[PDB]
């Protein structure tokens, strides 16, 4: 462990989190990242993964929700992420829920949020990506892809049409798109929706045609997961992001704010996510790439998700407590563990628990 990792985790982040409300802290983080104001890990070949029609120089991505409006993409690559996912972006601008809407549970290394899809909207984000479109084309070619998580407006009558709007507007600027699914006449509704998203995707010109992934929560029933796996295979959905935050409250949470409404992220989600990855990988016969997310704050965490079936991983909440150096830390620890377990690279470890 580096000097920076320890200073940030032991001193700087606790101090900053004690001086700032959580929403301000997140806002500040976006502004510092967008300005490239970052502590200074060369990515080995062993971290490279090929999936989703793309080289990923390393398999550690930034999860959706950090950079909701696509303001900090370049700084997120500078921070050392192998890929960046922006959003969720809704079609029209919207404010999201009233404040306060994000909460730290430092004793649990957890966050609860109820942002409510606060979004600048498609049009603002489209112009923002357009301004750096060619810079991104070089980044993607260099193994640093961009994802866009697409949302729906609060008062949308037609969810499918909102996502279709997102495909049309941001699909041409993305390497991959993500649509968040909640509980599924439910399987048929999901089919109808994903059909429409794929049809819209397929209507884009070849060079501007993104992969489509479905992101799930960890709170689905067995039946919901079976149905999602079935639909995903039937329709040729390109991948799964496993998982979003949980509405559960695992026994053992200590933070005072544990009973705040919202999604819980960070360490208490970790194993629930991993086991979701495991089930989705088995239900799709290892044929659907999975991006694994939820409580990754170490190499071990990352490797457990990979071995359970993830091709790639994302983290977000760990940044709250470790700051930017966590990115280098996870990569360094993952590489070391890959070597200790006999894997030539990340690719060999994907789904290794199932074999």
Ligand X SMILES: O=C(O)c1cc(=O)[nH]c(=O)[nH]1
Ligand Y SMILES: CCN(CCO)C(=O)Nc1cc(O[C@@H](C)C(F)(F)F)c(C(=O)Nc2c(F)cccc2Cl)cc1F
Residues at the contact surface with ligand FMN, assessed by CB under 6 A: 63-65, 68, 87-88, 102, 111, 113, 115, 149, 180, 215, 244-245, 265-266, 269, 293-296, 315-318
Residue identified by tokens 């005072």 is 256
CB of 269 to ligand FMN, least distance (A): 5
Q: What distance in Å separates the CA atoms of residue 52 and residue 58, rounded to the nearest whole number? A: 14
CB of 334 to ligand X, least distance (A): 25
Q: What distance in Å separates the CA atoms of residue 86 and residue 174, rounded to the nearest whole number? A: 10
The answer to whether the Cα torsion of 96, 163, 81, 69 is positive or negative is negative
Q: What distance in Å separates the CA atoms of residue 343 and residue 345, rounded to the nearest whole number? A: 5
Nearest to 177 by CA among 192, 156, 162, 191: 162
The answer to whether the beta carbons of residues 266 and 237 sit under 8 Å apart is no
**Catalytic entry in 34, 44, 156, 183:** 183
Say whether 114 counts as a known binding-site residue. yes
Say whether 298 counts as a known binding-site residue. no
- Name which of residues 115 to 134 contact ligand X (CB under 6 A): 115-117
Nearest to 165 by CA among 206, 232, 119: 119
93 counts as binding ligand X under rule CB under 6 A: no
Say whether 118 counts as a known binding-site residue. no
Say whether 113 counts as a known binding-site residue. yes
The H or E element that residue 333 is part of is helix 326-340
Choice from 2, 4, 7, 17 touching ligand Y (CB under 6 A): 17
Binding mask 300-339 for ligand Y (x = CB under 6 A): ----------------xx-xx--xx---------------
Q: Is 265 a residue of the active site?
A: no
Q: Which residues bind ligand Y (CB under 6 A)?
A: 12, 16-17, 20, 22, 25-26, 28-29, 32-33, 37-38, 66, 102, 104, 111, 316-317, 319-320, 323-324
């Amino acid at each position: 462990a580096t000097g920076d990792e320890r200073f940030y985790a032991e001193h700087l982040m606790p101090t900053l989190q004690g001086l700032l409300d959580p929403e301000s802290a997140h806002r500040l983080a976006v502004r510092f990242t967008s300005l490239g104001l970052l502590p200074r890990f060369q990515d080995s070949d062993m971290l490279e993964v090929r999936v989703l029609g793309h080289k990923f120089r390393n398999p550690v991505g930034i999860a959706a929700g950090f950079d909701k409006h696509g303001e900090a993409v370049d700084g997120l690559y500078k921070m050392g992420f192998g890929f960046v996912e922006i959003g969720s972006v809704t079609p029209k601008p919207q404010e999201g829920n009233p404040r306060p809407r994000v909460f730290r549970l430092p004793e649990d290394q957890a966050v609860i949020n109820r942002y409510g899809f606060n979004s600048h909207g498609l049009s603002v984000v489209e112009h923002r990506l357009r301004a750096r479109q060619q810079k991104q084309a070089k980044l993607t070619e260099d193994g640093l892809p961009l994802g866009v998580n697409l949302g729906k407006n609060k008062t949308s009558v037609d969810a499918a049409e909102d996502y279709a709007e997102g495909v049309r507007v941001l699909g041409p600027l993305a390497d991959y798109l993500v649509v968040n699914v909640s509980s599924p006449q439910g399987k048929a509704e999901l089919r109808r929706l994903l059909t429409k998203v794929l049809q819209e995707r397929d209507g884009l010109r070849r060079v501007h045609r993104p992969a489509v992934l479905v992101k799930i929560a960890p709170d689905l029933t067995s039946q919901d997961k079976e149905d999602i796996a079935s639909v995903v295979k039937e329709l040729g959905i390109d991948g799964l992001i496993v998982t979003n935050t949980t509405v559960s409250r695992p026994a053992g949470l200590q933070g005072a704010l544990r009973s705040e409404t919202g999604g819980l992220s960070g360490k208490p989600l970790r194993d629930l996510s991993t086991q979701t990855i495991r089930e989705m990988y088995a239900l799709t016969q290892g044929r659907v790439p999975i991006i694994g997310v939820g409580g990754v704050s170490s190499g071990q965490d990352a490797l457990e998700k990979i071995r359970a079936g993830a091709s790639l991983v994302q983290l977000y909440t760990a940044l709250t407590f470790w700051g930017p150096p966590v990115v280098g830390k996870v990569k360094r620890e993952l590489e070391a563990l890959l070597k200790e377990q006999g894997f030539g690279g990340v690719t060999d470890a994907i789904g290794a628990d199932h074999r």
